[PDB]
Amino acid sequence: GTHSHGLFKKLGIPGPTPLPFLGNILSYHKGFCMFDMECHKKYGKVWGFYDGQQPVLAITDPDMIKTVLVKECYSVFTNRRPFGPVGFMKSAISIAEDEEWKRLRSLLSPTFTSGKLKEMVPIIAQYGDVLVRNLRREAETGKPVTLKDVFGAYSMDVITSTSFGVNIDSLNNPQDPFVENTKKLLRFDFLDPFFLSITVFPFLIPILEVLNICVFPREVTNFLRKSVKRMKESRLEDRVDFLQLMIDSQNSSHKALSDLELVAQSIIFIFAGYETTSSVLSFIMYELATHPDVQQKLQEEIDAVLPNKAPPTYDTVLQMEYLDMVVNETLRLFPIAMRLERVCKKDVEINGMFIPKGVVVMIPSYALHRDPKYWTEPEKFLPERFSKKNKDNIDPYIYTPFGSGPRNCIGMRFALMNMKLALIRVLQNFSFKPCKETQIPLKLSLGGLLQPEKPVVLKVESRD
Amino acid sequence: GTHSHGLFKKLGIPGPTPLPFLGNILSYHKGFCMFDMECHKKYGKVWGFYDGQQPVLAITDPDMIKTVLVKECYSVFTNRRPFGPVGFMKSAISIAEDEEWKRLRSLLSPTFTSGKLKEMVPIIAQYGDVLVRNLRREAETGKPVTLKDVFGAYSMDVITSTSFGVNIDSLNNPQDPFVENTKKLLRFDFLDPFFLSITVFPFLIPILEVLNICVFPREVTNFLRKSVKRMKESRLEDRVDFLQLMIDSQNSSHKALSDLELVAQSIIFIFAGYETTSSVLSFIMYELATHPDVQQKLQEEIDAVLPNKAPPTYDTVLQMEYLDMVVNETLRLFPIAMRLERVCKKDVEINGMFIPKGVVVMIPSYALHRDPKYWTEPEKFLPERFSKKNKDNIDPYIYTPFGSGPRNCIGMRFALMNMKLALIRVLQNFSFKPCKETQIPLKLSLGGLLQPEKPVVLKVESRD
Ligand code: HEM
C-alpha cells in the first residue's frame, strides 16, 4: 500500500507523512484551502503529499511557478490531473491533453478575441437589464435576496444567449428544458464521496468508462448533443454566438472542429463559466455590502462614467479603474479554482529542483493569495492594493486567479467583462446592505469548492 | 458493446465482422496463424479486426511495412501492444515505450555488437560440448530423443553462462534453484484463458497491477532480483557476460542503467532468448531429419570447414553458407513471433492510407512467409531459396523473422551465432532420423504459440 509513498523521503522533499492507501486525504477534513495554508506555514517553500497513491508536489516560488505554467508548458507541464470517467467529454479543451489540446486551443482562441468580445457585449448587456427588473421586484418586496439565485440566473442567461443564441429568462422559466438541464452542470467537488473514492480507487475509472458511467451526467449531455444538432440543422436554412463561431471555424492547418468535438466545447464552456461567474459575483456583492465605503465609491465611479443610468458599453467598462480594483481584490481573497495543477510529463530539473515523471505539480493559489510574505493585512478586503500606485508591487505568478501561461483561462476577458456589466447595472439601480441572516464574517465551506458555508443573503434597496 | 466496432466500416477497410464485446477472438479457435492466412486470402492487401474493443489493422504491403517499422518508427509507430499486468517489468526494453525505450536501446546496443559477440563464443562453444556429451548417452541408448528437452537445456546453459556467469549443466541439475526458476520463464500464450480474459476485460489490468499480480510470476522475479543483487555485490571484490557489460555501462548522456532497470533487462533477455532459441533449434532438426539430403549436404559443409571434428569458431561459423541457408529457410516456415505489432500513436497517412490514433498496426509475418505471391512452393522446405543465386529476389519486409527497423530483435546476431554453434557440434557427431512417434507432417498447435502440436522426437545415431 506504499509503493509510491516513499518518493518524497527519497528526494529530500518535506511534507505530511502519508497513510497506507489513503495518502494524506484525511488531512482534507478542513478542505483544500486550509490544508495548503498549514503545509505552507509548516514546510515552507516546497512540499509533497499523496492523493491516494498520487504524489503531489506543491510549489510556491514565483520563478519556479513561471517555468511550469509558462516556460516548459509545452515540453513538460502540459496537462491537468485526470479526474474520473469522462466519456466523449475527453475532447473538451479543458480536459484534452498534449497535441489534441494544442489543436483545440489554436482552433478556439480566435473565438475569445477582444474583437469578438465587444461584438457580444450587446447580448450580455440585454440580460443585465433582465437581471435588474428581476431584482427590483425582490427589492420593492423588501425581502432578503439570495445572490446564488439571482446571479446564477444571470450567468445562465448569458451562457444560453452567447453560447447558443437561446434567449431565456431562466429566473422566470425554471422549467424550460434548456434551463433545467444546463442548471445541472455544477462544478465538481473533488472531496465528495464519489471523487474521494475515485482518488483511493483510481484503478476503477476504466471500469466506469466501459459502463458509460460519466461524471458529466449522460442525461444532460445527451440533451445538449441533440439540442446542438438541432441548432446546427436549423440556422443553416436561415448571429454572433460561440456555436456559430465554431460552426464557422469548421470552414478554413489543423483539422476543423468535428461535430462531436464542437458539442464538447459548448458543454465545457457552460461548466467552466456558469457556477464560477455566479460565485464571484456573489463574493463581490458580499464585500460591497460589508464595506459600504467601497460600494459608495464604486457607485460614484459608475455614475461619473455612465451619467443618468446610461447603459454600459465595452469601452466604458474598461474605463472604470475602481471597478477593476474591486473585482480583482475579490478574486485575491476568493480564487475559486483554489489550485492550479500540471502533470510532470518527464524527469526535469527546474530551478535546481528535480521533478520526476508522473508527479502532479500544484500551485496553491488560495494560499499564495493570503500569504503574509507578499500581502499586507492578507485577510482584509482592501481594493487599493490594485490601484496603479500599488499594483506594480504585485507578482503575476503569486496572484493567479485565472492561472497563467498558454493554458490559462481562455474565457478570462469574457468572464471579466461579463461580471462587470452585471455589477454596473446592479449598482446603478440598487444598494446592498447586510441582514441578520448575513454570515459576518463569511465562513468558507470545508468542502472541495471555495464557496460560502451558508449561502449569502442581503438587503437590496432601490436608489430611486 | 460496439463503441469502437464501427471504425473499419467508416474508414472503408474490410475484414471479418465483430461480435459485441468479443471482437473477432472466436476466430482464433484455429490460432493466430490460420486466422491471418484466411483474412489475407479473403480480404487481400489490408484488413481490420478487433481483439475485444481493440482495433487491429493488418498490412501486407512491403512499402507500407517499411514506413511503419523503419520510417516513422520514432514519430508514430514506436511501441507494441500493452499486454497485461507487468509491475516493475515495465522497464524491460521489450516492454518500455517512447523515450524510455530509446534510452534503453541506446544503453544496451553496445552489448550486442559483433565485437562483444565473438568475445562470448568461447562461452557458448563450451556448452556445445556439454550438449554433445549429453546427446551421445541418449544416442548410445538408442531411445528416441525429445528435442524440446535437449535444446531447452542447451539454451538455458547458454543464458545462464553468458547472462550471469553461472555455469550449470541444467540437463543434469534440474534442481539447481537457478535452473528451476529460469525454466519457469516461458513465452506467453496470448490465447490461453488468462490472456483471452484480459483481452475481453482490459479494464481489469489496473486492478491486477494494484494487487502486484503480474504475468511474470513474482516468485521467479524475486529470486533473480536477489540473485543479481548477490552477483552484483560479489564480483566487485574479485568476466565477459551481459550482467558485467550492464554493470560497466553504469559508469560513463542518458542516465546510466539503474539497479532495478538492470535486473529487468537480465530477466527479459532470458524470456526473449530461451524458449525461442530452443523452438527454432527443434524446428531445424525436424527439417534436417525429414530431408536427409539437406542433412548430409550440411554435414558435408561443416566437415570441409572444420576438418577432423575441429571446434567451431566465430569466423568459421559465418563461413558456412549452407548452414545459413538452412537456418533461414527454417525461420521462413516457422517465424515463431508470428506477428509484428506497433501502436499507431497519432493520426497518420502512410502510403495513401489513413491510420487513426490508437489502432494496432500488425504485420502477419507467418502469413507473408507462406504467401503464394512471393514464394514458389510455399509449404516446401527448400533451403536453395537463400542461395546467393536466389536471395536477392527476397524482400526484407516480406521475410521478417526478426522484425525490422530500430525496434527489431536486439539479440538477432547473438541468437543466430548461438543456434549455429549448436548445429555444428551436433551434426559433427550425430545424424538425426525420424521415428514412428515422429509426427510427419508436423502439425502446428492451434494455440497462440507457433510450436508443434505434439513435441518432436527423433533417432540420434552417432557418426563414430
Ligand atoms: C470568474 C470566472 C472564471 C474564473 C475565476 C476562471 C478560472 C480559471 C482557472 C484558474 C483556470 C485554470 C487555468 C490554469 O490551469 O492555469 C481556468 C481554465 C479554463 N477556463 Fe476559466 N474561469 C472563469 C470563467 C470561465 C469562462 C466564462 C469560460 C468560457 C466561457 C472559461 C473557460 C475556461 C476553460 C475552457 C479553461 C480550460 C482552458 C484550457 O485548459 O486550455 N472560464 N479557468
Ligand code: HEM
Ligand atoms: C531465434 C531466436 C529469436 C527470434 C526468432 C527472435 C525474434 C524477435 C522478434 C520477431 C522481435 C520483434 C521485433 C519487432 O517487433 O520488429 C524480437 C524482439 C526482441 N528480441 Fe528477439 N528473437 C530471438 C532471440 C532473442 C535473443 C537471444 C535475445 C537476447 C538475448 C532477444 C532479445 C530481444 C529483445 C530484447 C527484443 C525487444 C527489442 C526491442 O523492443 O527493442 N531475442 N525478437
Ligand SMILES: CCCCNc1ccc2c3c(cccc13)C(=O)N(CCCC)C2=O
Ligand atoms: C484519478 C482521479 C482521482 C480523482 N480525484 C481528484 C481529481 C482531480 C483533482 C483532485 C484534487 C485533489 C484531490 C483529488 C482529486 C485537486 O486538487 N485538483 C485540482 C483542482 C483543485 C480543487 C483536481 O483537479
Ligand SMILES: CCCCNc1ccc2c3c(cccc13)C(=O)N(CCCC)C2=O
Ligand atoms: C490489453 C491487453 C490484452 C491482452 N491480449 C493480448 C496482448 C498482447 C498481444 C495480443 C495479440 C493478439 C490477441 C491478444 C493479445 C497479438 O497478436 N500480439 C502480438 C504477438 C503475436 C503472437 C500481442 O502482443
